[PDB]
Amino acid sequence: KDLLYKYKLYGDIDEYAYYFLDIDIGTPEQRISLILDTGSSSLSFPCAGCKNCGVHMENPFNLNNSKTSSILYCENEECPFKLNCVKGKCEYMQSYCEGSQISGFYFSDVVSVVSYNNERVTFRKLMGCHMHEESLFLYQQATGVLGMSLSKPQGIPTFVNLLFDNAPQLKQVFTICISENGGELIAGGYDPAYIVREAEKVVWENVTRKYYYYIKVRGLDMFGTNMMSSSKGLEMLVDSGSTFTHIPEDLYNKLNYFFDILCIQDMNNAYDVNKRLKMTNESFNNPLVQFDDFRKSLKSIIAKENMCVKIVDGVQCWKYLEGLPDLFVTLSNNYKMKWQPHSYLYKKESFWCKGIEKQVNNKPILGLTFFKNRQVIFDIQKNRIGFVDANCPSHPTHTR
Ligand SMILES: CN1C(=N)N[C@@]2(c3cc(F)ccc3F)CN(c3ncccc3-c3ccccc3Cl)C[C@H]2C1=O
Ligand SMILES: *[C@@H]1O[C@H](CO)[C@@H](O)[C@H](O)[C@H]1NC(C)=O
Ligand SMILES: *[C@@H]1O[C@H](CO)[C@@H](O)[C@H](O)[C@H]1NC(C)=O
């Protein structure tokens, strides 16, 4: 019942591995597609002149063509926001993967964000110009990154804080609703009409740290058995910019053990099927408090011929969602939030592949495979993040 501004999201888990929206930048407008990333705060892309940039959906943003672009030069060799001064410009630098770096320079210009009901919000933004991209940036279709995290004291004003400072008619809330193909970013609150039904209720979880999107996960259950070797709160970044949900190797190895069992590549191979049916509560090292629920899945995966192909890294893909078990993450109190297979599995070709990976460098992340088929509600002012199952809008990329 609030006032909501809605923006179309494009992408998917398998082909793009992220979700992006379009943004007008400069004067006159240069449309730039940006990866929606709640795990970062910058807004960067390549710029005309880049001598090592990928081929993206748009050309590099052309400063000389924007009547209103202003390169942040360092006078006296001193940059604001404790930035570095290189070759007479305030440096933009990033590190990702294993030492890869995109370097460049900061500049400013007009950014315009329009909803699909034609409501326009404009403001000047500090942004980075990629003059050098590497690794995964050399082969993603999207042109840049739109960081969605909050502004720190005496830091570069971020897109989200500028958006709301220039839209006082909107409550300080934005929702991300991603489906298998494309999604929707909502500014001003969430749409209850997307909530499955009459409409279900939002689960609210306070955020552990301020300025960041961390929440505490105090347990992850499969078949009624917590696979987390600790009930202490595990801080996990609610990150729209990571394709998959990442977890500590202990929790992953204990989950992938039961997914491996449920993965049968040939339903007529006796050794494979025999090896799995000859399993009992006492052969797990982790007895299943709902071992019958486990048996239920296994029998049904063999009954309905839900075959499973393993791909790179030993990631399982099933023919059907039917059979795969629900997962339950434990939040504040003892509230168990259901994590359905249509979220943690993603569509690859015709199968459903596991979208749960090991954490890299003690960085547990609730990624897009946790977003999918939910509304993820960022209540900036109350320092809480909400989750509700929803029929998220869908937008094939041939509608842009
Ligand atoms: C999960 N995750 C992410 N959340 N965002 C990242 C990204 C997202 C994505 F869809 C595709 C490629 C990406 F590089 C980006 N990134 C960052 N992190 C903290 C400050 C800054 C960044 C960052 C901003 C812009 C350009 C390059 C970088 Cl490096 C870290 C990356 C990452 O691994
Ligand atoms: C969540 O935050 C509010 C406001 O700070 C506080 O009153 C409430 O007790 C918190 N709840 C939990 C479970 O931390
Ligand atoms: C399996 O073992 C756990 C723990 O001992 C128990 O709670 C559960 O009921 C057992 N299930 C079966 C089918 O034996």
Author numbering: 44 to 240, 272 to 474
Task: Please give me the paper's original passages concerning this structure.
Modifications to the P1 biaryl region of the IPF scaffold differentially modulated inhibition of both plasmepsin V and X. Notably, analogs with potent plasmepsin X inhibitory activity successfully blocked the growth of Plasmodium falciparum in vitro. X‐ray structures of IPF analogs in complex with plasmepsin V provided insights into their binding mode and revealed avenues to further improve IPF potency and selectivity between plasmepsin V and X. This understanding of how these compounds interact with the active sites of plasmepsin V and X will serve as a foundation for the future design of dual inhibitors targeting these proteases.
